[PDB]
Amino acid sequence: MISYDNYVTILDEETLKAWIAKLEKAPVFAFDTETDSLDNISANLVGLSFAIEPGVAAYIPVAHDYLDAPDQISRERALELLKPLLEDEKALKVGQNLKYDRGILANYGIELRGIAFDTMLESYILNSVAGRHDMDSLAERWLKHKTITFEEIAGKGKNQLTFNQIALEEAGRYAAEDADVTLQLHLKMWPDLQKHKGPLNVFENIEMPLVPVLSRIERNGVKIDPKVLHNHSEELTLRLAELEKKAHEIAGEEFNLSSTKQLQTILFEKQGIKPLKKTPSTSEEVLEELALDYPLPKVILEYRGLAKLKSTYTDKLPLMINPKTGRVHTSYHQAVTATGRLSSTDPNLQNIPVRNEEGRRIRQAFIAPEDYVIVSADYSQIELRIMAHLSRDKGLLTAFAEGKDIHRATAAEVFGLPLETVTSEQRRSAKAINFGLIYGMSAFGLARQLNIPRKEAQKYMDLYFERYPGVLEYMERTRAQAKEQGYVETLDGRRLYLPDIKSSNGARRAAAERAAINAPMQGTAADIIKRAMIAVDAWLQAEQPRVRMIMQVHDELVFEVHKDDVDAVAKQIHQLMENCTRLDVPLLVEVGSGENWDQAH
Ligand SMILES: [Zn+2]
Ligand SMILES: [Zn+2]
Numbered sequence: 113m114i115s116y117d118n119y120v121t122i123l124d125e126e127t128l129k130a131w132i133a134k135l136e137k138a139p140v141f142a143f144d145t146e147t148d149s150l151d152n153i154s155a156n157l158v159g160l161s162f163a164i165e166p167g168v169a170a171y172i173p174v175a176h177d178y179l180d181a182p183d184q185i186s187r188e189r190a191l192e193l194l195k196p197l198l199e200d201e202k203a204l205k206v207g208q209n210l211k212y213d214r215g216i217l218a219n220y221g222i223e224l225r226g227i228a229f230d231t232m233l234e235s236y237i238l239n240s241v242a243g244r245h246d247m248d249s250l251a252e253r254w255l256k257h258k259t260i261t262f263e264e265i266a267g268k269g270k271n272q273l274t275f276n277q278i279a280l281e282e283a284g285r286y287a288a289e290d291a292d293v294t295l296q297l298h299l300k301m302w303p304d305l306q307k308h309k310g311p312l313n314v315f316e317n318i319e320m321p322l323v324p325v326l327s328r329i330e331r332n333g334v335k336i337d338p339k340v341l342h343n344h345s346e347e348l349t350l351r352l353a354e355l356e357k358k359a360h361e362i363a364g365e366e367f368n369l370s371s372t373k374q375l376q377t378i379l380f381e382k383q384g385i386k387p388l389k390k391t392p393s394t395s396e397e398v399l400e401e402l403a404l405d406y407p408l409p410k411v412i413l414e415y416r417g418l419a420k421l422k423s424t425y426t427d428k429l430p431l432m433i434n435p436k437t438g439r440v441h442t443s444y445h446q447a448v449t450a451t452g453r454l455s456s457t458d459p460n461l462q463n464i465p466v467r468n469e470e471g472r473r474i475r476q477a478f479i480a481p482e483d484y485v486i487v488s489a490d491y492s493q494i495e496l497r498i499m500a501h502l503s504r505d506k507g508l509l510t511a512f513a514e515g516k517d518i519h520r521a522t523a524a525e526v527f528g529l530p531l532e533t534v535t536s537e538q539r540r541s542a543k544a545i546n547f548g549l550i551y552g553m554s555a556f557g558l559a560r561q562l563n564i565p566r567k568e569a570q571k572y573m574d575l576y577f578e579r580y581p582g583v584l585e586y587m588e589r590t591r592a593q594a595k596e597q598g599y600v601e602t603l604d605g606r607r608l609y610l611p612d613i614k615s616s617n618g619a620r621r622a623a624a625e626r627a628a629i630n631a632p633m634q635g636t637a638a639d640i641i642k643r644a645m646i647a648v649d650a651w652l653q654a655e656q657p658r659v660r661m662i663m664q665v666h667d668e669l670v671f672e673v674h675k676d677d678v679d680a681v682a683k684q685i686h687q688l689m690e691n692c693t694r695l696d697v698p699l700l701v702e703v704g705s706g707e708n709w710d711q712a713h
């Protein structure tokens with residue numbers, strides 16, 4: 113194991129000062145904080161750990177307060193001695209998920225600068241899909257060393273200990289090992305991150321600079337009106353009771369709204385075709401098929417939809433209000449998606465229905481504080497613009513070039529008719545293709561979304577490829593380079609490794625190919641969105657305007673802008689986002705404002 117002999121436990125200033133001096137001259141050093149909580153805004157710093165060299169690390173406990181805890185350097189004294197080093201941009205730090213530590217120090221008025229390396233992001237850029245990018249998985253994968261787990265020193269369940277309760281030396285082993293391991297992981301990973309300029313560029317100019325901006329976004333939080341969320345809940349309880357009555361009324365007797373059990377014996381037993389509807393789902397939905405004429409399945413649909421949304425947002429959100437800030441602080445995960453896109457949880461802002469009335473009501477509960485307004489800056493169909501560029505198709509490119517609706521423009525070409533006369537059915541068909549292309553969907557899968565027969569979908573696709581040849585070429589060239597080199601890249605060099613590309617397996621290899629076409633567009637959107645965040649944050653930081661970047665969901669950045677600054681600020685956000693990112697993709701940023709996220713959205 114790791115004993116109390118491996119790492120020093122700093123209990124006196126003199127020794128801390130000695131270490132600080134060595135740290136000032138180290139080329140890089142692993143830094144890490146221990147706290148009494150995962151909640152960043154309310155966590156108290158319990159200790160700090162540093163690693164100057166592999167095997168040379170220390171734990172500085174400052175707030176262990178269990179029964180008879182030995183004297184420790186006070187948190188304040190330790191922080192005033194460490195502050196210059198932490199605030200020195202020239203002092204390069206390495207750490208596992210530094211976003212977290214930057215916030216903790218910020219709880220003490222300390223601005224963690226020199227956030228050079230994050231082993232989590234190191235691991236993520238090298239290969240996003242290689243596995244989990246947490247330190248335990250990292251240590252094992254790269255160093256064949258199994259780190260002391262948090263559960264090993266803290267325990268489990270409700271009776272788990274918070275860091276300040278753990279014995280100094282136990283805390284020390286765990287803490288100092290993390291710092292040590294982090295530095296080693298960096299030393300193994302950093303050299304590798306250089307074998308390829310692409311990943312290197314992404315890591316250096318996209319992922320790393322994003323670290324403190326995510327911290328800032330998460331910590332700013334978002335204002336949610338619990339009252340509105342509650343009224344919506346009550347009302348929803350009423351709509352569910354009514355919708356259930358409407359179901360019982362359409363048929364006879366009572367029943368749960370559970371298919372393949374209660375519905376089959378009702379829906380098809382009163383005429384309809386035997387197969388149910390898998391809640392497999394976004395391809396086969398016999399419930400909404402019947403919905404265009406049959407009334408019952410349509411209400412079972414709307415019932416369940418509201419049922420999920422209520423327990424998930426209406427009921428959960430108010431419970432997420434942080435007592436300290438009175439705001440909701442979402443958790444962004446920077447090293448989770450295969451494509452490089454930021455994901456979000458507690459709450460998962462992306463799963464809030466976009467085109468739906470209830471989802472719209474959810475957003476209304478995201479409000480701007482007094483004298484501020486919510487401002488939504490969105491990249492209009494960036495993934496489709498990226499494809500226009502990646503496919504070098506004069507047609508699409510010109511469509512975006514002259515501000516025409518690419519879905520109507522696409523339909524006007526596929527079906528061959530004036531742009532003014534393209535009907536809604538045509539536009540919806542062209543749209544299904546356009547968005548079907550990004551996800552690399554097969555002609556049969558396109559038919560499943562448009563309700564047209566197979567080969568009619570194919571007829572639409574061949575016509576598309578004929579009118580938009582460069583799209584097929586891009587698609588063929590990407591599936592090609594995916595097999596040849598086992599991965600695809602984004603414009604910035606971000607890589608998605610496709611291990612099942614030459615799978616010899618049917619669907620598994622098919623998925624790898626879909627992923628091959630998709631990732632370059634999704635990944636590029638991801639990079640751009642990240643570059644805009646860094647760009648906008650830099651301006652926020654440098655110019656200190658009356659604005660807070662509060663969210664990032666899908667392809668939009670949401671802020672709180674002071675009501676009297678809305679115009680100047682919107683002109684400025686808009687320029688940063690579409691002129692200070694990639695100058696190659698034809699970008700457009702839709703900026704909107706309102707009293708809440710829905711109005712600005
Ligand atoms: Zn940490
Ligand atoms: Zn740690």
Ligand SMILES: [Zn+2]
Binds near residue numbers: 493495637
């Ligand atoms: Zn998109």
Ligand SMILES: [Zn+2]
Binds near residue numbers: 686
């Ligand atoms: Zn513009």
